[PDB]
Design an enzyme around this catalytic site. Structure first.
Site, mmCIF file in Angstrom:
data_model
loop_
_atom_site.group_PDB
_atom_site.id
_atom_site.type_symbol
_atom_site.label_atom_id
_atom_site.label_comp_id
_atom_site.label_asym_id
_atom_site.label_seq_id
_atom_site.Cartn_x
_atom_site.Cartn_y
_atom_site.Cartn_z
ATOM 1 N N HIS A 43 0.601 -1.247 0.007
ATOM 2 C CA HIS A 43 -0.077 0.079 -0.074
ATOM 3 C C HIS A 43 0.898 1.231 -0.148
ATOM 4 O O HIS A 43 0.054 2.384 0.223
ATOM 5 C CB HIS A 43 -0.911 0.071 0.964
ATOM 6 N N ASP A 99 -0.411 -7.265 2.102
ATOM 7 C CA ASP A 99 0.215 -6.176 1.777
ATOM 8 C C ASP A 99 1.839 -6.201 2.114
ATOM 9 O O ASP A 99 2.523 -5.822 3.195
ATOM 10 C CB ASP A 99 -0.222 -5.392 3.191
ATOM 11 N N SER A 205 4.027 3.384 7.986
ATOM 12 C CA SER A 205 3.612 2.167 6.942
ATOM 13 C C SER A 205 4.973 1.421 6.353
ATOM 14 O O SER A 205 5.754 2.422 5.854
ATOM 15 C CB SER A 205 2.710 2.281 6.126
#
Ligand SMILES: *C(=O)[C@H](CC(=O)C=C(C)C)[C@@H]1[C@@H](O)C[C@]2(C)C3=CC[C@@H]4[C@](C)(CC[C@@H](OC(C)=O)[C@@]4(C)C(=O)O)[C@H]3CC[C@@]12C
Lengths: 259, 36
Positions: A43, A99, A205
Site C-alpha cells: 500500500h 500487504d 507504514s
C-alpha cells in the site's frame, strides 16, 4: 511513531526511507534485506482509493539516515530503483490482506556503520518468537499523534524513533476491529489496562517490526507495519504483515534475477 | 540471486559487533518468557 523514543545512531541499520521524488515528500518506511533488495508494504506503492500508484521512476530510496530532514552527508545513501514487486493477491480493497512489496535497487548498496541487512525469519525462529506477550520493535519517522485532524502536541519527529510493543493474541485482535483479519497478519501493542502506550502511526507504514533472537543474537524482521484504525487508541491494536507466512514469495522473486 | 546479506545479517556494526547493547534491547529480551 506514537509514544516512543529517539533512535540511537547505528540502532537501526536496515532502515530505508521511501521518498518521493517530485515533489519531495516522505511516503513510508522500508527495510534493507540484501545489497540489492528492499521490502516495504504494498500500500505504500499501490493504493487505488487514494490515487497513489507509483512506479520505479517516482520513488527514490534513502538508506542510512537518522534525521527526518537533514542531508546526512557521508552517512546516507540515496539510490533508485530498478523494478517493483507487489504481492499479486494483495487485497487493497477489503482489508489490506497481503500487504507486501519487494523493491529492487538499480545498483547494490555499500554496507556500513549505518547500512546493514536485517534477517528474514525461519520456521524455528517464527515459532519461538512470535508469541503473545513477546515484545518486538517498531521503527520510523512518522507522526507523533493523530494528525488525522491536526492535533494535540508533537508533529512529525525530527529524527528516527523507536518503540517496543508486545504481540497480542489472535482473538483479542479479531475482536478489536470490524475488519476481517487474516492469517497473513498479526497485531501488537498494549492492552488498555497494561498501562503503557505506543503504536505506529501514519508515515510508519512499511517499516519493520523486528525481534531479537536469543539463540543467535541476531535481528529479525518478523513483520511490516501495515495498518490500523488510528494511532494509539485504547483497546485498538496495530496490524502487521506476517513476513514469515509470506516467505516463499520473497524467495521466488529474489530467485529471479542475478549472479 | 545472492547478492544477499543473508550471511552477516541482523548484526549491527555499531552494537553486537562492537559488543554493545542499546538502551532498550534489554526489555525485548526480558520478555522472552518473562525471563532474562
Ligand atoms: C502508514 O503510515 C499508515 C499505516 C499506519 O498508520 C499503521 C498503524 C497506525 C499501525 C497507512 C497509510 O499509508 C494509509 C492507511 C493505509 C490507511 C488509509 C485509510 C484507512 C485505513 C485503510 C484503515 C481503515 C480506514 O481507517 C479509518 C476507518 O479510520 C481507512 C480506510 C480510512 O481512514 O478511511 C488506513 C490503514 C493504515 C494507513 C493509515
Amino acid at each position: 511513531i506514537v509514544e516512543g523514543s529517539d533512535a540511537e545512531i547505528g540502532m537501526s541499520p536496515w532502515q530505508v526511507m521511501l521518498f518521493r521524488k517530485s515533489p519531495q515528500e516522505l511516503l513510508c518506511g522500508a527495510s534493507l534485506i540484501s545489497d540489492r533488495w528492499v521490502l516495504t508494504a504494498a500500500h505504500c506503492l499501490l493504493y487505488p482509493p487514494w490515487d497513489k500508484n507509483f512506479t520505479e521512476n517516482d520513488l527514490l530510496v534513502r538508506i542510512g539516515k537518522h534525521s527526518r530532514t537533514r542531508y546526512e552527508r557521508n552517512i546516507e545513501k540515496i539510490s533508485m530503483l530498478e523494478k517493483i514487486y507487489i504481492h499479486p493477491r494483495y487485497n487493497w480493497r477489503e482489508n489490506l490482506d497481503r500487504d507486501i512489496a519487494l523493491m529492487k535497487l538499480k545498483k547494490p548498496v555499500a554496507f556500513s556503520d549505518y547500512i546493514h541487512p536485517v534477517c528474514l525469519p525461519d520456521r524455528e525462529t517464527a515459532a519461538s518468537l512470535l508469541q503473545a506477550g513477546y515484545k518486538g520493535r517498531v521503527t520510523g519517522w512518522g507522526n507523533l499523534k493523530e494528525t488525522w485532524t491536526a492535533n494535540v502536541g508533537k508533529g512529525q519527529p525530527s529524527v528516527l524513533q523507536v518503540v517496543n510493543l508486545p504481540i497480542v493474541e489472535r482473538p483479542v485482535c479479531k475482536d478489536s476491529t470490524r475488519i476481517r483479519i487474516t492469517d497473513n497478519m498479526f497485531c501488537a501493542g498494549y492492552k488498555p489496562d497494561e498501562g503503557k502506550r505506543g503504536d505506529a502511526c501514519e508515515g510508519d507504514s512499511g517499516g519493520p517490526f523486528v525481534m531479537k533472537s536469543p539463540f543467535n543474537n541476531r535481528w529479525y524482521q518478523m513483520g511490516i507495519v501495515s495498518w490500523g484504525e488510528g494511532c494509539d487508541r485504547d483497546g485498538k491494536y496495530g496490524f502487521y504483515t506476517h513476513v514469515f507466512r509470506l516467505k516463499k514469495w520473497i524467495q521466488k522473486v529474489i530467485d529471479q534475477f542475478g549472479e | 540471486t545472492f547478492g544477499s546479506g543473508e550471511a552477516d545479517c541482523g548484526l549491527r556494526p555499531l552494537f553486537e559487533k562492537k559488543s554493545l547493547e542499546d538502551k532498550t534491547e534489554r526489555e525485548l529480551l526480558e520478555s522472552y518468557i518473562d525471563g532474562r
